[PDB]
Amino acid sequence: IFEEAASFRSYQSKLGRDGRASAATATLTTKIRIFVPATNSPELRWELTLFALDVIRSPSAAESMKVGAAFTLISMYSERPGALIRSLLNDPDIEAVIIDVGSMVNGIPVMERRGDKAQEEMEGLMRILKTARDSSKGKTPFVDSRAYGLRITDMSTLVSAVITIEAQIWILIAKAVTAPDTAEESETRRWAKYVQQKRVNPFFALTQQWLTEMRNLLSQSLSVRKFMVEILIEVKKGGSAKGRAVEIISDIGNYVEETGMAGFFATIRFGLETRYPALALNEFQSDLNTIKSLMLLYREIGPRAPYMVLLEESIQTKFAPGGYPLLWSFAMGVATTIDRSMGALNINRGYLEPMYFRLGQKSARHHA
């Protein structure tokens, strides 16, 4: 009877989710160049890292170069850096050329191992590097200047440094694509942890200027975030040994998961699991039926679920906490009253339901 209606709401939520899209939907593929560390020699690897840091730091380089730079920077983990990128990178909008560097013996820029079709390739690179230095007023990637000059020759120092730079990229991801302003407090708090706990070597610390340039790159590029979230999912899975490298990633992961699914979690944690007497009220029924459909839906979205927000994924709109307003308004009213740490999240949405906001507060705070 009434059961038909509830089942129908569920039917609508699942309807047409299935099937396989026609290939005509394929968006025009962008050719992106990834310069990638050729061998396990520390001389090449340090210099290539410096090159890549500077590509990203350059004010005059185009977006196409900058994304490729960012891909070099966050592939430095790998024993076979080119293979790591090519094999995990799985996003249709971008078609990769991976270029394995010739020991970077050319000079400031990466040096074409087999020789350029155009000899200016080397110079466009030179202009890019010069403009990078000049526009940044001489500021090298590191905060403390000896590090900018380092020119490393040994594996131990290399890994100390690489782990350190990588960790400083991955600190950013957590906020770069949810609120890239307000970001600094959180990302410094996470940095302090990794350094204090001796996971990464602070002698190699990367400058606010480099970090802001990378944070902005993350905010403004989907294609970068696609590769990042691919890796973030891959290393979240168990069934493998990890070195210091994968360990830092996994550590960052514990901040990164669930991020930008705030509302879905907040109604589950506060209000639903809170089970305040007010949950029995007739008005809530529609909201409860909503959440049920949401939980089953969340299951169906599957492996990408811990990173929906970062992926910009379509499904996430349905999850948007704005979807279940009565329950949500009450869920904030409880949450903000009961947890002193909560409520520092800005919840000024027009979707707040006054009755539930006053009633959630009145349940949690002045009802025992």
Q: Which is nearer to its own copies, 53 or 224 (CB)?
A: 224
Helix (H) or strand (E) holding 32: strand 30-36
CB of 122 to its own copies, least distance (A): 14
Q: Which is nearer to its own copies, 158 or 332 (CB)?
A: 158
Residue 142 phi/psi, 5-degree rounding, is -85, 155
Helix (H) or strand (E) holding 166: helix 155-176
Q: Which is nearer to its own copies, 134 or 182 (CB)?
A: 182
Q: Please, how many CA atoms are within 13 Å of residue 338, restricted to the half-sphere of its CB? A: 19
Copy the structure tokens of residue 175. Answer: 């906020």
Copy the structure tokens of residue 65. Answer: 């170069």
CB of 135 to its own copies, least distance (A): 20
Position 30: which residue type? T
- Alpha carbon distance 8, 2 (integer Å): 10
Q: Which of 232, 166, 226 is nearest to 199 (CA)?
A: 166
Q: Which is nearer to its own copies, 139 or 199 (CB)?
A: 199
Q: Which residues contact 34 (CB under 8 A, 6 or more apart)?
A: 68, 71, 72, 75, 82, 85, 96, 97, 98, 99
CB of 335 to its own copies, least distance (A): 10
Position 51: which residue type? F
Position 15: which residue type? L
Q: Which is nearer to its own copies, 25 or 137 (CB)?
A: 25
Q: Which is nearer to its own copies, 60 or 87 (CB)?
A: 87
Spacing of C-alpha 175 from chain mean position: 7
DSSP notation for 206-243: BPHHHHHHHHHHHHH-HHHHHHHHHHHHHTTS-SS---
Copy the structure tokens of residue 272. Answer: 């639903």
CB of 50 to its own copies, least distance (A): 16
CB of 283 to its own copies, least distance (A): 4
Q: Which is nearer to its own copies, 41 or 209 (CB)?
A: 41
- Alpha carbon distance 232, 129 (integer Å): 30
CB of 42 to its own copies, least distance (A): 6
CB of 21 to its own copies, least distance (A): 4
Q: Which of 269, 287, 260 is nearest to 335 (CA)?
A: 269
Q: Is 190 part of any known ligand binding site?
A: yes
Q: Is 194 part of any known ligand binding site?
A: no
CB of 187 to its own copies, least distance (A): 16
Q: Which is nearer to its own copies, 130 or 199 (CB)?
A: 199
Q: Which residues contact 19 (CB under 8 A, 6 or more apart)?
A: none
Residues marked as binding for RNA?
Answer: 175, 190, 255, 349
Q: Which residues are annotated as a binding site?
A: 175, 190, 255, 349
